[PDB]
Design a protein around this ligand. Structure first.
Ligand SMILES: [Ca+2]
Ligand SMILES: [Ca+2]
Length: 703
């Protein structure tokens, strides 16, 4: 401090277009199996987009919830469960199950895109200590309890004098060293940028740091957070949200000693960033500021060290939120205008791009709103023609080639209009390479506009290649660095020789299913199934009980779901085929189905109720009463036989009727004359046996 590489490592952000892909409610294994591949297929034709912002933590009160596995965060869970059997206090994916973030990071890299990572600065600490979160009530307390009762933690806290101070300062340093650093070191250079929201809210307003100060001692939490990220990738760009700047001056609040780029929160609070009307002026002037200052935020002030800090904006495309929204806030013409003013010879914009449905608990559709794609494709057309005129433009940030498979036929296409284009529309007149190339590699035009890198490497090939790839139009040549890497096979698989796609083991024992509960198990490439030649693979269910449903999530991830009934109890056997189109191999899949807990098995083969007396919710005088009895909560059969509930005794007002296969509805209006405890008996009978239970409703008289 001060860093000579401050802002210079964010040099790529000048002229960069960004997007936001953010799912909501990521707690308790909801994020396990979630993939970005659907989004990337939808944005295929967008060729001028440079990066995508991903979460590590969620915003606001959802800051403890993580989308990446960590042993310290996983130990905070302690195996807590609810009434249904689902996890509680699990604010991360389980390390044994899935790393969803790594999947997205690799998929974005394969798409030729850089990454920005969202982390809310409040993190595992609770934003509102007075509030308790229904899905994770104890996590924040348990994180605090871990920090002042661990040998490795206390040795770090005591290691420096500045670590303790006002508020929850000691826990903030703990997150940077043990959680944030361990994450950054794992993913390496797959993360290009970090943005830290609510930075001033917790680091300044609670923990007593000064973001305005030039002194290193005043920005120690800022140091701890930045150095943690630089431990994994030293070239990672860092931003802190120290709120919006001044409308009557610099629209970005002045940089800390650890800001590579400006977080760039728009003017106005929640909701529309252009309505009311004055906010349009403020936020567009911010965009114009980026243009006037060539994408450098702080070349106006009297400070020398912040001269390379990149001007960057984080707006909302919609009228409501950053990650979702039904309505655009700007018109098609305005959206293109705002972006081009902001980035073309300016700075960078990460557009808060709305998805259809972000709630993972409510059938998530994690692809763009049709308008968001519409506005982005129109912007894409403009930037293709006008951002870098003359010489050819290479798409996005990287051009990624397939891995070298020794002895195997290599072939990859690079398409005009896709990987590269002449901005003026005459056309690409040729593509050649320069540098240390493979001897087997051939570059030729197979069709009009499509160039092919083909050939067959020898079995002895075990060296990586790095060379420039030159694309030509009538104006000149643009270079793009392309890499070739030899494939590294995962351990635990035996190469069959002939190139048959192989399963890990026969048979395969997966996690235990439970009756009347939605099952969740993943099948991942390089873990459960593998192809030694890297062909695109298909999994098929061939035999077994009907309940198990197979769905594809991505090229490397498949999901097993479905609800087993009471009839499916015991060991279940399945056959699953992995194929490449030529060759295939089968395996046996073994999933044990347990009965619903709480219900007592009599042995007579008879149905059973949850209790001898079912004490229902209170009723009200002259008000309509509703209660639904569900299978596996109130009543259960151990064989899975069709069940019928009939009334046998009790007051006239309450009657029963079947809603569906699982549920039976109790309805009727009680009056003030029916006040007090109301006794009922109901009979549950299948094809043979029968059983009775008492139902108790306390009718309250309205006075
Ligand atoms: Ca300056
Ligand atoms: Ca094969």
């Amino acid at each position: 401090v001060p860093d000579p590489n401050q802002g210079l490592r964010a040099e790529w952000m000048r002229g960069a277009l960004g997007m936001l892909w953010l799912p909501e409610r990521t707690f308790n294994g909801n994020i396990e199996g979630i993939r970005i591949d659907d989004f990337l297929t939808q944005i295929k034709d967008i060729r001028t987009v440079d990066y995508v912002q991903l979460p590590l933590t969620s915003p606001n009160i959802f800051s403890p919830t993580h989308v990446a596995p960590h042993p310290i965060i996983e130990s905070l869970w302690q195996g807590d469960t609810d009434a249904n059997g689902d996890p509680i206090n699990l604010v991360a994916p389980r390390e044994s199950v899935d790393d969803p973030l790594l999947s997205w990071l690799k998929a974005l890299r394969a798409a030729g895109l850089r990454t920005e990572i969202y982390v809310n600065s409040y993190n595992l600490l609770a934003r509102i200590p007075e509030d308790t979160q229904a899905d994770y009530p104890d996590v924040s307390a348990r994180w605090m309890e871990w920090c002042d009762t661990n040998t490795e933690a206390q040795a770090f806290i005591n290691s420096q004098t500045y670590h303790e101070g006002n508020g929850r300062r000691k826990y903030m340093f703990c997150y940077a060293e043990f959680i944030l650093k361990e994450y950054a070191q794992r993913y390496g250079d797959l993360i290009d940028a970090w943005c830290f929201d609510s930075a001033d809210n917790v680091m300044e307003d609670e923990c007593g740091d000064d973001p305005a100060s030039e002194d290193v001692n005043d920005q120690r939490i800022y140091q701890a957070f930045a150095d943690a990220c630089h431990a994994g990738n030293p070239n990672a760009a860092i931003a802190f949200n120290n709120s919006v700047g001044d409308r009557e001056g610099n629209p970005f609040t002045s940089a800390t000693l650890f800001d590579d780029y400006t977080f760039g929160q728009p003017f106005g609070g929640a909701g529309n960033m252009v309505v009311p009307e004055a906010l349009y002026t403020y936020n567009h002037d911010l965009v114009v500021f980026m243009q006037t200052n060539n994408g450098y935020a702080f070349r106006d002030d009297t400070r020398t060290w912040n001269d390379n800090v990149v001007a960057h904006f984080f707006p909302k495309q919609s009228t409501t939120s950053w990650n979702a929204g039904n309505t655009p806030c700007l018109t098609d013409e305005q959206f293109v205008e705002w972006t081009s003013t902001g980035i073309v010879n300016g700075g960078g914009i990460t557009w808060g791009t709305p998805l259809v449905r972000t709630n993972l608990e409510n059938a998530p559709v994690l692809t763009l709103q049709p308008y968001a794609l519409n506005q982005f494709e129109l912007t894409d057309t403009y930037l293709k023609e006008f951002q870098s005129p003359g010489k050819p433009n290479w798409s996005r940030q990287y051009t990624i080639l397939p891995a070298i498979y020794p002895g195997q036929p290599y072939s990859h296409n690079l398409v005009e209009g896709v990987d590269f284009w002449d901005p003026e529309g005459v056309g690409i007149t040729g593509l050649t390479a320069s540098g240390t190339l493979p001897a087997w590699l051939t570059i030729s035009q197979t069709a009009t506009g499509t160039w092919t890198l083909s050939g067959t490497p020898p079995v002895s090939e075990a060296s990586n290649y790095t060379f420039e790839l030159m694309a030509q139009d009538s104006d000149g040549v643009t270079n793009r660095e392309v890499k070739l890497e030899v494939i590294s096979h995962p351990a635990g698989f035996t190469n069959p020789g002939d190139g048959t796609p192989v399963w890990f083991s026969n048979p395969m024992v997966l996690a235990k299913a439970t009756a009347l509960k939605d099952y969740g198990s993943l099948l991942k490439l390089g873990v459960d199934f593998y192809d030694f030649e890297g062909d695109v693979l298909t999994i098929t269910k061939t035999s077994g009980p009907d309940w198990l449903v197979l769905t594809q999530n991505s090229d490397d991830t498949w999901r097993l779901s479905g609800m087993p009934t009471a009839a499916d109890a015991g060991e279940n056997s399945f056959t699953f085929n992995v194929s490449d189109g030529i060759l295939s191999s089968d395996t046996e899949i073994k999933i044990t189905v347990d009965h619903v807990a709480g219900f007592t098995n009599l042995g007579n083969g008879a149905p059973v109720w949850s209790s001898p007396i079912l004490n229902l919710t209170d009723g009200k005088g002259s008000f309509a009463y509703n209660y639904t009895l569900q299978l596996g909560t109130d009543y259960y059969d151990f064989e899975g036989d069709a069940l019928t509930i009939t009334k046998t005794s009790g007051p006239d007002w309450l009657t029963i009727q079947q809603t569906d296969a699982n549920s039976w509805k109790l309805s009727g209006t009680p009056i003030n004359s029916d006040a007090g405890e109301n006794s009922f008996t109901f009979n549950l009978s299948d094809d043979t046996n029968s059983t009775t239970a008492e139902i108790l409703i306390n009718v309250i008289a309205t006075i």
